[PDB]
Design a protein around this ligand. Sequence first.
Ligand SMILES: Nc1ncnc2c1ncn2[C@@H]1O[C@H](COP(=O)(O)OP(=O)(O)NP(=O)(O)O)[C@@H](O)[C@H]1O
Lengths: 383, 163
Amino acid sequence: KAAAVKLKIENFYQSSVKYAIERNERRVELETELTSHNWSEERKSRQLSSLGKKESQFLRLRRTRLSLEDFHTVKVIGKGAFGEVRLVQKKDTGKIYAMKTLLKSEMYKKLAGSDSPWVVSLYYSFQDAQYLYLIMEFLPGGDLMTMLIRWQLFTEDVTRFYMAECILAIETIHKLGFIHRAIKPDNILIDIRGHIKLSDFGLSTGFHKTHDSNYQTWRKSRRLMAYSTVGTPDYIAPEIFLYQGYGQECDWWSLGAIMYECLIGWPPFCSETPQETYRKIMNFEQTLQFPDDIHISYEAEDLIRRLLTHADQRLGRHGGADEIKSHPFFRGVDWNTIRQVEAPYIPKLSSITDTRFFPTDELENVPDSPAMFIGYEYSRFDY
Amino acid sequence: IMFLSEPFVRTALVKGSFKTIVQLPKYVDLGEWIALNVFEFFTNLNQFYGVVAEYVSLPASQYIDLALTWINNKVNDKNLFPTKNGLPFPQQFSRDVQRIMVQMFRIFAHIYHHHFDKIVHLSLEAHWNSFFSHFISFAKEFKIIDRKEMAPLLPLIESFEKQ
Ligand SMILES: Nc1ncnc2c1ncn2[C@@H]1O[C@H](COP(=O)(O)OP(=O)(O)NP(=O)(O)O)[C@@H](O)[C@H]1O
């Protein structure tokens, strides 16, 4: 009986068909998630147990609502090009919460979840207009370059502890089909128990290309303006610049750069400028020098020498993640028991707001600000 | 040259699947699952009148920002909304959404009356129906909406399968 057709002439809803193609998914999403309800009918008749009324209770959850200023900031912690990090608590409940401010647009490059023992576990995400905001588990023990400043470690069984435990830290990274490919003392955090959790590159950007063409208190000439631009080829296996390549061997190499700075106290290539690496770091071989402060074990030295060998394939293995554990440098440990052991240094903090292991100060630069509500929908549940 | 009129919503033929969604899941607190479905039905309806925005059996209307943002402000009033942990709800909310599920309708069938005319023309036509069917078959499930209230949209309600 009925008839006609086909108008679609108006500015009006230019895009408002967005309702149509969105809601379908929200309906698809609605459906499955309500058969996600049927994680019930799991049905144990198995036990002879209670009785004892109803052993089932579930809120269940909520998809809730959010904001900043629902967050009472405790203190500042760190910064970046994408954004700024912090230490905060939730104004409502109160809690130990790390806080990551970052840049959405404008930020470029416009997969995997989580977990592991060795990695800072990301809680969740939300964003306002310009900035991205995060929560991760707060790790009270600062970062590793921060520890290197206050005392440039004299190591041995201190560092024997800090590698190993870092080998395993990367172990789960590569095991999970990843290369962290950012090996930084400040990419590494120390937990309450004195052990290590590294967050991840995250993944926040930057690169060195192609090249540039121009034409004990005396050793405290470390801490040079921190960075506040960064990053240096502290590590930067020179398989990255130049071209594509690498895999794991970038990471192990990059840990040779941290072995050095732990023992004798500086990036081997310490450039005093940004671009004396690539340079030195590109080259090495000839440009890797071992000073006459002549104390080191053979085993500690030989290790940085198989670390700072190439990414080299061909005759050999590298081939790593093990053969690496095989090294005589490591007496033990059981490679498990390391998780619970006296950490040569466990942070002494009088309270839980203690920032004592982070350098407050100030800078105030995020070349962004002009200057002048979020959502939750997931599957699983924590903790 | 310069004359207008009113209504006429008819008829049917739309969208997909069936039912079973609006049913309270096993062993879930009702007060939650209410707030859930209504905190959906709002944004979706507003996303639909967000399509018909401006362009102006019904009031003189074109108020509806006055009517909807009453609810936009009232869904953002935290004290009716069990956000925190296990922190619970008044259950005097019965007066609240026996009012509030049905405020939504008064825009709903208002769109259906006069402005479901344009709805078709978009060729969104079939979404409005099952979404309304879902809003309804939620309300007809829980008696959340009173019966006498439903008069103007009753014809579309007569449909093949809704609830
Ligand atoms: N949960 C935490 N525990 C300890 N330190 C943290 C925590 N969250 C953030 N930080 C600090 O924030 C600093 C830097 O944050 P980060 O995400 O690394 O900035 P970035 O420029 O994005 N990444 P990177 O270049 O490796 O520093 C770290 O070095 C830590 O000092």
